[PDB]
Design a protein around this ligand. Structure first.
Ligand SMILES: CC1(C)S[C@H]([C@H](NC(=O)[C@H](N)c2ccccc2)C(=O)O)N[C@H]1C(=O)O
Ligand SMILES: [Cl-]
Length: 238
């Protein structure tokens, strides 16, 4: 029962300290929890995607141990190797578990800028850097064999390095901490945010994946495209 993050609902599978929810035949959401100190549990979500005989991960859990539990769940439930992981910015809820991925021999990718900020944010950098074009699309040579993951840098928003990921062959796109749900009362932690550019960045994410109907985000259950539009409206007020 987290203080922040979606509550458990029908069909959620508890596995150790984590929760897994199937979103599509080949896509699952992973959820892990961190107690912030007298405030209670904060849930954070990422994705697991099956692509033929391999698995792709978006975001770590908060900690190495939680991330190792995600790999255990994949081993038990899917029993295919993880080819790579993409982390969406250099903060604990998205990159806290890097060491567990590396110990497992999984290739890790992040925005070059995330890797550059990682030491200052108390994170371990990914082993490979993604770079982006002037319109935000990933340079394909930096994202080799990404299968259905379509990586897009929408512009500075929640952080300057935040990236997003569409799942090709599905109607799902992942906004990470940039996007908050359609009924959110705030944009969350704006401590590292670009308030000037936030609204345009949120709308750019919506425009990059214009037919994604299921929007997955770090701290709420998957939502409609109203998550994008509501996030942008909140950001318009900054
Ligand atoms: C939901 C939150 C208000 S708390 C969650 C996280 N917080 C962080 O990742 C922080 N950068 C952090 C977490 C633990 C310790 C220090 C900073 N991120 C925020 C957000 O996405 O807006
Ligand atoms: Cl944050």
């Amino acid at each position: 029962r987290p203080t922040i993050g979606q509550q458990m609902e029908t069909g959620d599978q508890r596995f150790g300290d984590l929760v897994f929810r199937q979103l599509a035949p080949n896509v699952w959401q992973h959820t892990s929890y961190l107690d912030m100190p007298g405030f209670g549990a904060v849930a954070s979500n990422g994705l697991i995607v099956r692509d033929g005989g391999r698995v792709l991960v978006v975001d770590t859990a908060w900690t190495d141990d939680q991330t190792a539990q995600i790999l255990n769940w994949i081993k038990q439930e899917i029993n295919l190797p993880v080819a790579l992981a993409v982390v969406t910015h250099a903060h604990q809820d998205k990159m806290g578990g890097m060491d567990a991925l590396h110990a497992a021999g999984i290739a890790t990718y992040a925005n070059a800028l995330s890797n550059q900020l990682a030491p200052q944010e108390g994170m371990v950098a990914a082993q490979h850097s993604l770079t982006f074009a002037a319109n935000g699309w990933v340079e394909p040579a930096t994202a080799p064999n990404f299968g259905p993951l379509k990586v897009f840098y929408p512009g500075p928003g929640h952080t300057s390095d935040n990236i997003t990921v569409g799942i090709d062959g599905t109607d799902i796109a992942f906004g990470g901490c940039l996007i908050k749900d359609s009924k959110a009362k705030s944009l969350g932690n704006l401590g590292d945010a670009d308030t000037e550019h936030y609204a345009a960045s949120a709308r750019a994410f919506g425009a990059a994946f214009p037919k994604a109907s299921m929007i997955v985000m770090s701290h709420s259950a998957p939502d409609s495209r109203a998550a994008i539009t509501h996030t942008a409206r909140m950001a318009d007020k900054l």
